[PDB]
């Protein structure tokens, strides 16, 4: 039995934030407790959107409810896209007290702040969130899944190669997270302009306090569409696989990214099968075919090989 506390957004239609993390973790055998940080008709990639957001105090209300009935015991805490700095400071308090109620509680954090386009990245969230993620959040994170744009901001050091990209990660580990994964970066992969490159190193503390920093590289064949929520579906499954492979980041990212590709391919197909030739598919048709990728989520056919080091 493994109980995860997933504090992310919810949407009536589509798979983003919690909608993107729940079903996977559930079919992967996990016990998902979901706090919906917001509830909107759909993600903001759409033309329109309406909805309500959960504030800082309401997040707490729900936590006290859990605490009062003495059911605030968890094995994992998964947080993602957040706009409110007060809401995030609240997430840190919760995570710190949950780590006191004691389990080898693993805090999987996706430091969502924006994405990267070659020279400068467009920040999604307000810049008053960076300090908090850097100063209060990451320090208590165990597994963080940033962008390259995110890894950079977090360390205040920009990335221009695989080499200095591992230097940013080493810098990250120092802040607290023993596991880091750069889910996507500008870096040209040894496979061509056609492949996206993911990076990630695990600084394991083996018996007798030795150092162990296994680093890896993943190459996912890109896809002709702009998907929403892939970051969320990723961190969720990563959570799942790193549980199965606690010291084998290699196999965890493999299974993770492999299932990633299976769902994205199945998605881009139905989006196309649902859109005439010459017309670009809509955020609506690009929604992940989640329910359909069940088995693939359950048992990912390894079509990717993690390059050790
Ligand atoms: C930031 C950009 C995107 C749009 O492409 N919109 C969006 N919108 C989201 N929405 C669904 C939540 C939401 C709705 C209204 C205001 C704030 C947050 C959302 N939840 C997780 N994610 C990403 C990080 C996978 C979400 N992304």
UniProtKB/Swiss-Prot annotation:
Report the active site residues.
232
Residues the record lists as binding ATP: 147, 183-184, 220-223, 230-231
The reaction(s) catalysed by this protein are: pyridoxal + ATP = pyridoxal 5'-phosphate + ADP + H(+); pyridoxamine + ATP = pyridoxamine 5'-phosphate + ADP + H(+); pyridoxine + ATP = pyridoxine 5'-phosphate + ADP + H(+)
| Molecular function as annotated in GO | ATP binding; metal ion binding; pyridoxal kinase activity
Q: Give me the residues that bind pyridoxal 5'-phosphate, please.
A: 9, 44, 124, 229-232
How is the activity of this protein regulated? Answer: Activated by K(+). Activity is increased in the presence of Na(+).
Binding-site positions, pyridoxamine: 9, 44, 232
Spell out the family assignment given in the record's similarity comment. Belongs to the pyridoxine kinase family.
Q: What does this protein do?
A: Catalyzes the phosphorylation of the dietary vitamin B6 vitamers pyridoxal (PL), pyridoxine (PN) and pyridoxamine (PM) to form pyridoxal 5'-phosphate (PLP), pyridoxine 5'-phosphate (PNP) and pyridoxamine 5'-phosphate (PMP), respectively. PLP is the active form of vitamin B6, and acts as a cofactor for over 140 different enzymatic reactions.
Annotated protein name in UniProt: Pyridoxal kinase
The organism's taxonomy opens as:
Eukaryota, Metazoa, Chordata, Craniata, Vertebrata
Q: Which gene encodes it?
A: PDXK
């Amino acid at each position: 039995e493994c109980r995860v506390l997933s504090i992310q957004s919810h949407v009536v239609r589509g798979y983003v934030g919690n909608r993107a993390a729940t079903f996977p973790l559930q079919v992967l055998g996990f016990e998902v407790d979901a706090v919906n940080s917001v509830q909107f008709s759909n993600h903001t990639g759409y033309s329109h959107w309406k909805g309500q957001v959960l504030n800082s105090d309401e997040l707490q209300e729900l936590y006290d409810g859990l605490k009062l009935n003495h059911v605030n015991q968890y094995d994992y805490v998964l947080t993602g896209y957040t706009r409110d700095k007060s809401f995030l400071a609240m997430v840190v308090d919760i995570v710190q007290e949950l780590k006191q109620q004691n389990p080898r509680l693993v805090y999987v954090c996706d430091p969502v702040m924006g994405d990267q386009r070659n020279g400068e990245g467009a920040m999604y969230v307000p810049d008053d969130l960076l300090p908090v993620y850097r100063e209060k959040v990451v320090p208590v994170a165990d597994i963080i899944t940033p962008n390259q744009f995110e890894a950079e901001l977090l360390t205040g050091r920009k990335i221009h190669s695989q080499e200095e990209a591992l230097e940013v990660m080493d810098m990250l580990h120092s802040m607290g997270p023993d596991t880091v994964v750069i889910t996507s970066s500008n870096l040209l992969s040894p496979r061509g302009s056609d492949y996206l490159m993911a990076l990630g190193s695990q600084r394991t503390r083996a018996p007798d306090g030795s150092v162990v920093t296994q680093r890896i590289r993943m190459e996912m064949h890109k896809v002709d569409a702009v998907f929403v929520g892939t970051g969320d579906l990723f961190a969720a499954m990563l959570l799942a696989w790193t549980h199965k492979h606690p010291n084998n980041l290699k196999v965890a990212c493999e299974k993770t990214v492999s299932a990633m590709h299976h769902v994205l391919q199945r998605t881009i197909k139905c989006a196309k099968a649902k859109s005439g030739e010459g017309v670009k598919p809509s955020p609506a048709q690009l929604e992940l075919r989640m329910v359909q990728s069940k088995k693939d989520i359950e048992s990912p056919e390894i079509v990717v090989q993690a390059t050790v080091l």
